Design a protein around this ligand. Structure first.
Ligand code: MG
Ligand code: MG
Lengths: 181, 119, 182, 119
């Protein structure tokens, strides 16, 4: 397996993953010391569910979207991503780029709307089992907006052939339901 | 009356470290990014600051400076990922005490912040 | 920026392995934690902390090829287990990558052909950066069982390029190899 | 008096698994690789096997075939990696009783050998 730049890139990403796990071992041994054995167990399970989703996402034959979500927090953004896959695993390869692209657009609208003092969190949920649509996207955000007026264009005027079903935005939260066909 | 500021982007550890000192007679101040940390340094003027160096959005090494442009007396202990030797130096070369690579033993942090900040 | 379309497929693949290994560690902890084997878990964790420490060490040696090689080793199909330490904190071994990496794969192949496949074969490789002359010294400490130790006699009787295989002894269940680079 | 074979490449999972089954009145047997495993299945003819499928060297679906070539009534529980659907169904058709992905609750593992250990 080669190309020295590419090789340097994987080595680098595996290094990020490493830190994440070390932080987790930090939460594990930290409580492990304060003798809170029921939290440690609690955490571990949360860990197994995040890992459980990462997997699923890595099995939708949608590599460009998976790579974006798995690396998003390893880049200098102003919010953290938590994603989950609702429904069984399907072959959404016919949707990879559409999604990947749509997410890029929503992703920076956010990184140009969120305050930078607030602890910003964004949860994206990819549903593969809807009865009427082939795929709906849910985005739940909590934090602070500096330029909330940035979501304007996409509010009145949507984005491509994606039915933006709902888009609510309050003081510190933002809800978006986008459907795909 | 000894002030300590915790600055990590992960709640868990932030809550953890808190409860830790939240025990040894220390008034503790939390924070999730550099922009918030300053304001606290600026407003409540902490004694020691344990600063996470790899927080998305912040150049700890940058807020490290700022933090000193506000009170150089500032006693800052950096929490790092193991192997970031240059960041550690540049930092200790900016005015910090000693790095602590994660996952650090929960023991020696209270210990070490004691022999660094008697209460 | 738009990502390469291989980096894409090779990260997911790789992280899927690292995920599973990290799930095996969670099995050791949660399992043994349930047995209330309380402090072994501490033992087990530092055990983990250490490894990661070399994973980072090897990485910062400026030898991306040797590294990627060593990191993905147990995610491939070999018949011995690889463990690697980096003794003496980090230097710049860029000139040494392609060589060590090229040499190792060779060696590794030999072990896969020499060791028996019923035994638990474990190989430890050590990179030493602290030594009067010999910019870097490679150590190979292996134990298990060989079904054709004679696959080694050759490089033993011929060496490899401009590298001095200092010690190279094959016993009944172990093997020690020292290779210096200056 | 009931035999159980633990086939996982990692000592911890092995030591654990049995430091669990002995305390449930069983005869434990460990195996680090397909080959050692097959042998045991030949000489100690166990009642149930716990087979890791991500063991390097030998393919967990080839030693399953082989384990059954020895004992058509061999009882095997596979320990897989999450998301490997395709493997569960392949080794299920080869006579695998059920699967457990890692990590697992050491308690529903017990209920498992118990549910498949014949009368
Ligand atoms: Mg952090
Ligand atoms: Mg395994």
């Amino acid at each position: 397996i080669s190309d020295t730049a590419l090789t340097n890139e994987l080595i680098h990403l595996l290094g990020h993953s490493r830190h994440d796990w070390m932080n987790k071992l930090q939460l594990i041994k930290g409580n492990l010391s304060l003798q809170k054995y029921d939290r440690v167990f609690e955490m571990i399970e949360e860990m197994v569910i995040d890992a459980k989703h990462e997997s699923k996402l890595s099995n939708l034959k949608t590599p460009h979207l998976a790579f974006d979500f798995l690396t998003f927090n390893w880049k200098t953004h102003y919010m953290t991503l938590e994603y989950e896959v609702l429904g069984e695993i399907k072959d959404l390869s016919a949707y990879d780029q559409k999604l990947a692209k749509l997410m890029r657009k929503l992703f920076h609208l956010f990184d140009q709307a969120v305050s930078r003092e607030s602890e910003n969190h964004l949860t994206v949920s990819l549903q593969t089992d809807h009865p009427d649509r082939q795929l709906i996207l849910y985005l739940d955000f909590h934090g602070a907006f500096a330029d909330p007026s940035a979501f304007d264009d996409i509010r009145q005027n949507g984005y491509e052939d994606v039915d933006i079903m709902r888009f609510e935005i309050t003081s510190h939260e933002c809800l978006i339901e986008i459907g795909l066909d | 009356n000894e002030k300590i500021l915790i600055v990590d982007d992960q709640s868990g550890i932030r809550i953890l470290l808190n409860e830790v000192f939240n025990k040894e007679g220390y008034q503790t101040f939390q924070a999730a990014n550099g922009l918030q940390a300053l304001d606290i340094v600026t407003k409540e003027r902490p004694d020691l600051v344990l600063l996470d160096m790899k927080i998305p959005g912040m150049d700890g090494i940058e807020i490290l400076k700022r933090m000193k442009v506000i009170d150089e007396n500032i006693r800052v202990i950096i929490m790092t990922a193991y192997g970031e030797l240059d960041m550690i130096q540049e930092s200790k070369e900016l005015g910090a005490l000693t790095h602590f690579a994660k996952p650090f033993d929960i023991d020696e942090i209270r210990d070490a912040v004691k022999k660094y900040l008697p209460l």
